Amino acid sequence: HHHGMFSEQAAQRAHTLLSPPSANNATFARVPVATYTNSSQPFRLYATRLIQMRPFLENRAQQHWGSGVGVKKLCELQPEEKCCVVGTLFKAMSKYIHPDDELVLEDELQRIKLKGTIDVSKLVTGTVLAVFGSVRDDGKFLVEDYCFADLAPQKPAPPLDTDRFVLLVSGLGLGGGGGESLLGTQLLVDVVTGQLGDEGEQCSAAHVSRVILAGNLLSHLTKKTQAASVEAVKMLDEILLQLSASVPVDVMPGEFDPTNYTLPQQPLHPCMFPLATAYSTLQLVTNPYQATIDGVRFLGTSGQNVSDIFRYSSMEDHLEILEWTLRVRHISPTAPDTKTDPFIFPECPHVYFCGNTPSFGSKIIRGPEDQTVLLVTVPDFSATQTACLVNLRSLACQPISFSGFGAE
Amino acid sequence: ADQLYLENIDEFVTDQNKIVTYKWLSYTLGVHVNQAKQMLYDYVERKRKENSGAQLHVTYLVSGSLIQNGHSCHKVAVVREDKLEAVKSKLAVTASIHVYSIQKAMLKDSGPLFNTDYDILKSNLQNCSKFSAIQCAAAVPRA
């Protein structure tokens, strides 16, 4: 989908700031940020997976290979029998993939090994597939074809009459990086706020409905180190403040932010952002974050999930790894069990984003029962100084890059 | 009226030797962020026609679309006076152009342009969106 990108709607009107002061001055009323619904409860706090996934992987294999029900558990397997086993994968011997790894398939009961034509550099420990082949003289199970649950059901987001934007940013990384990282950051804030730019920019920035910061806002003797870490947080407060005073802002915990390291990271503590928390517009959300903005279902994490799949996969492109999880109906299979897996898509998001990617990324993908889903990999602003702006009435991501001249 | 903000700015640049960014002037004279920009604009033209060679340096904010490989990226940049033409050209469709700062002495990097704005903020931390071109019904201290 291309139309209604930011730059376009932005240049949509005459310039004005290259002229002597006029009295008449435009001041824009932001869009009604009234239609929102945080829905990340299921984030506020391997059999079970296999149990929930089973119905899915089965109905996928059943359609993928027809009535010919290979539905046979790991126990009911008759050597040399062509069937379909549904289970969990385990691997064993930058990236920790081994020259030659191996995939063992676990059933609730036993666990069989795997041969055949199945990519290992691609799949990783925790995936839940529908394998097809027969048990061999080797004792190992040879595979000829496998599939995954894919995308869950998904009703279409209602139509919007006027474009609404969602600014996705990530990796502000306060603490280190050099003041250039700063001006850039100021410029970022100042654009959404309404400080810089001409009426065109402004009137469109004005159309931004919400701002999501996805983790890593702060990044990492004792005497000064403390002060520093304290200062940083302070700034982030100040930034969050300016933002809060202008538009709704959702903050997501990251790598090493004051909260649990495990995956469903619980929100940050209000005790950190005195200045900002004063605003009803600020909101500290869970890690894997879900919400429905202006009728569009968003879901994203501050990165980690993809960061891991990367460590144990061969996949290079994060945008891919991201698409991967969406196809494997599991936000982060690389994560441990603890009793419904929250990380299994109940319905399919409209926009699915990802944490501190090293580069901006975007792609729209479709699914079996034609579903539409916009993926986004929000770069680490710290080193990129970029963020995506998603227009919700068209699903168009477009990066925004800030910069200021250097000595040259 | 007008002849007033003009002197004010002169006293700032030339006499005080301060770096004048729209934001900074905005808060300083208490004026709409845009009208502040328009103010700098008028001030340079005068001082420029006046001396035709007065020690004055300007920086602009240029923003627009810049396609790299079929994929359109929006760019927002604070540039040094000269380069403005160059940057402006590289853009596919240009959205915003306006003065950003005014300084007597040229700046090595855009660095100070932050510091300046950052300080004046810490002192106004109280009301950031006061002179913004955007007002938000919800941004009212309640939660």
Curated annotation (Swiss-Prot), chain A:
Phenotype when changing E201W: Loss of POLD3-binding in a yeast two-hybrid assay
Positions of modified residues (N-acetylmethionine): M5
Protein's cellular compartments: Nucleus
InterPro entries the UniProt entry points to: DNA_pol_a/d/e_bsu, DNA_pol_D_N, DNA_pol_delta/II_ssu, PolD2_C
Keywords from the named record: Acetylation, DNA damage, DNA excision, DNA repair, DNA replication, Nucleus, Phosphoprotein
One Gene Ontology cellular component annotation held by this UniProt entry: nucleus
Single GO term (MF): DNA binding
Similarity comment: Belongs to the DNA polymerase delta/II small subunit family.
Family annotation (PANTHER family): DNA POLYMERASE DELTA SUBUNIT 2 (PTHR10416:SF0)
Record protein name field: DNA polymerase delta subunit 2
Organism: Homo sapiens (Human)
Phylogenetic classification of the source organism: Eukaryota, Metazoa, Chordata, Craniata, Vertebrata
Swiss-Prot record, chain B:
Documented effect of changing I9T: In IMD122; uncertain significance; the mutant protein is not detected in patient cells
Intracellular or extracellular location(s): Cytoplasm; Nucleus
Modifications the protein undergoes after translation, according to the UniProt entry: Ubiquitinated, but not targeted to the proteasome. Sumoylated. Sumoylation with SUMO3 may be predominant. It is thought to decrease the affinity for PCNA and Pol-delta4 processivity. Can also be phosphorylated in vitro by CDK1-cyclin-A complex, as well as CDK2-cyclin-A and CDK2-cyclin-E complexes. PCNA interferes with CDK-cyclin phosphorylation.
UniProt modified residues of type N-acetylalanine: A1
Role summary: Accessory component of both the DNA polymerase delta complex and the DNA polymerase zeta complex. As a component of the trimeric and tetrameric DNA polymerase delta complexes (Pol-delta3 and Pol-delta4, respectively), plays a role in high fidelity genome replication, including in lagging strand synthesis, and repair. Required for optimal Pol-delta activity. Stabilizes the Pol-delta complex and plays a major role in Pol-delta stimulation by PCNA. Pol-delta3 and Pol-delta4 are characterized by the absence or the presence of POLD4. They exhibit differences in catalytic activity.
Subunit structure: Component of both the DNA polymerase delta and DNA polymerase zeta complexes. The tetrameric DNA polymerase delta complex (Pol-delta4), which consists of POLD1/p125, POLD2/p50, POLD3/p66/p68 and POLD4/p12, with POLD1 bearing DNA polymerase and 3' to 5' proofreading exonuclease activities. Within this complex, directly interacts with POLD2. Following stress caused by DNA damaging agents or by replication stress, POLD4 is degraded and Pol-delta4 is converted into a trimeric form of the complex (Pol-delta3), which consists of POLD1, POLD2 and POLD3.
Entry domain remark: The PIP-box mediates the interaction with PCNA.
Disease tied to this protein: Immunodeficiency 122: An autosomal recessive, severe immunologic disorder characterized by recurrent viral and bacterial infections of the respiratory tract and skin, appearing in early infancy. Additional clinical features include poor overall growth, global developmental delay with poor motor skills, impaired intellectual development, and poor or absent speech acquisition. Some patients have diffuse skin rash, erythroderma, sensorineural hearing loss, lymphadenopathy, dysmorphic facial features, and tooth abnormalities. Death in early childhood may occur.
Name used for this protein in its record: DNA polymerase delta subunit 3
Organism: Homo sapiens (Human)
